[PDB]
Amino acid sequence: TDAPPVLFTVQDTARVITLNRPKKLNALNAEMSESMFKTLNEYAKSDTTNLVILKSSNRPRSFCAGGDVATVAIFNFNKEFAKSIKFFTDEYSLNFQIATYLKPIVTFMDGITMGGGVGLSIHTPFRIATENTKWAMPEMDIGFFPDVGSTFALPRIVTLANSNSQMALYLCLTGEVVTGADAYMLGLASHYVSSENLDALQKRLGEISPPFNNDPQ
Amino acid sequence: LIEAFRKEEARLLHKHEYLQKRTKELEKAKELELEKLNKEKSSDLTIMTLDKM
């Protein structure tokens, strides 16, 4: 009866996953993570799905403002530690699935991509940014650590002043927000596409298919 | 003739009991079969849905 937290739709041979928690800026809870993790395993087995597209229904306001840690805090105050460990096992397991996924995943970072949102894009070779992109890792101010495999990605993908993870440490320890073009130039985004062009891009992604006897992997 | 009348009555009564047992079995099997059909599988995640609407 209530709107599902994550919506799944077909785009020709592309499968679109849309985060559908606008009031929470698409914050990721255990329910969302579990749904996405299970549906991605099915798409991996399918022979009719060529690629997946992870987007939000709230663009350009936000793509994912981060994992739902406020709920995890209440669990700690209530000693519901089993609930908290379930929230992190689901999220981190989804970040590991995206990183090792054999089919192309294309994330549209059209809006605030902070925290869990970074985990949804940092692990995909096709992480598209826009003028509205706002990449940040504001965990040091909440007392947490850089999670969602950002300690394995940022030290390996940043482009400038990252010979010894210096820039990676700067973003993780200061929580600086990077915006649009700057995220693309730093290596946080693989591509820079105007938000207006995302509709056309999505349609083209659904129409392309592996040629002859080549699999989508 | 006494054996014929008593065997026929027994057969008729035994046939009613067998039908009643058979029908109940079929009914139980149908419920089980239907329950398996209604069981959610992992493949169901790939079927698009608009439950709310």
From Swiss-Prot, chain A:
Residues engaged in binding substrate: E91, G116, E139, D147
Location(s), subcellular: Mitochondrion
Keyword annotations: Branched-chain amino acid catabolism, Hydrolase, Mitochondrion, Phosphoprotein, Ribonucleoprotein, Ribosomal protein
GO terms of molecular function: 3-hydroxyisobutyryl-CoA hydrolase activity; structural constituent of ribosome
Keyword Disulfide bond: no
Assigned protein family: Belongs to the enoyl-CoA hydratase/isomerase family. Mitochondrion-specific ribosomal protein mS47 subfamily.
Note in the entry: Present with 3950 molecules/cell in log phase SD medium.
Function: Component of the mitochondrial ribosome (mitoribosome), a dedicated translation machinery responsible for the synthesis of mitochondrial genome-encoded proteins, including at least some of the essential transmembrane subunits of the mitochondrial respiratory chain. The mitoribosomes are attached to the mitochondrial inner membrane and translation products are cotranslationally integrated into the membrane. mS47 has enzymatic activity in vitro, and is able to catalyze the specific hydrolysis of 3-hydroxyisobutyryl-CoA (HIBYL-CoA).
Protein name: Small ribosomal subunit protein mS47
Annotated source species: Saccharomyces cerevisiae (strain ATCC 204508 / S288c)
Organism lineage string: Eukaryota, Fungi, Dikarya, Ascomycota, Saccharomycotina
Residues of the full protein shown: 34 to 250 of 500
From Swiss-Prot, chain B:
Free-text function comment from the UniProt entry: Component of the mitochondrial ribosome (mitoribosome), a dedicated translation machinery responsible for the synthesis of mitochondrial genome-encoded proteins, including at least some of the essential transmembrane subunits of the mitochondrial respiratory chain. The mitoribosomes are attached to the mitochondrial inner membrane and translation products are cotranslationally integrated into the membrane.
Disulfide bonds: none
Annotated protein name in UniProt: Small ribosomal subunit protein mS26
Further information: Present with 2010 molecules/cell in log phase SD medium.
Gene: PET123
Subunit structure: Component of the mitochondrial small ribosomal subunit (mt-SSU). Mature yeast 74S mitochondrial ribosomes consist of a small (37S) and a large (54S) subunit. The 37S small subunit contains a 15S ribosomal RNA (15S mt-rRNA) and 34 different proteins. The 54S large subunit contains a 21S rRNA (21S mt-rRNA) and 46 different proteins.
Full-protein interval shown: 107 to 159 of 318
Location of the protein in the cell: Mitochondrion
Family the entry assigns: Belongs to the mitochondrion-specific ribosomal protein mS26 family.
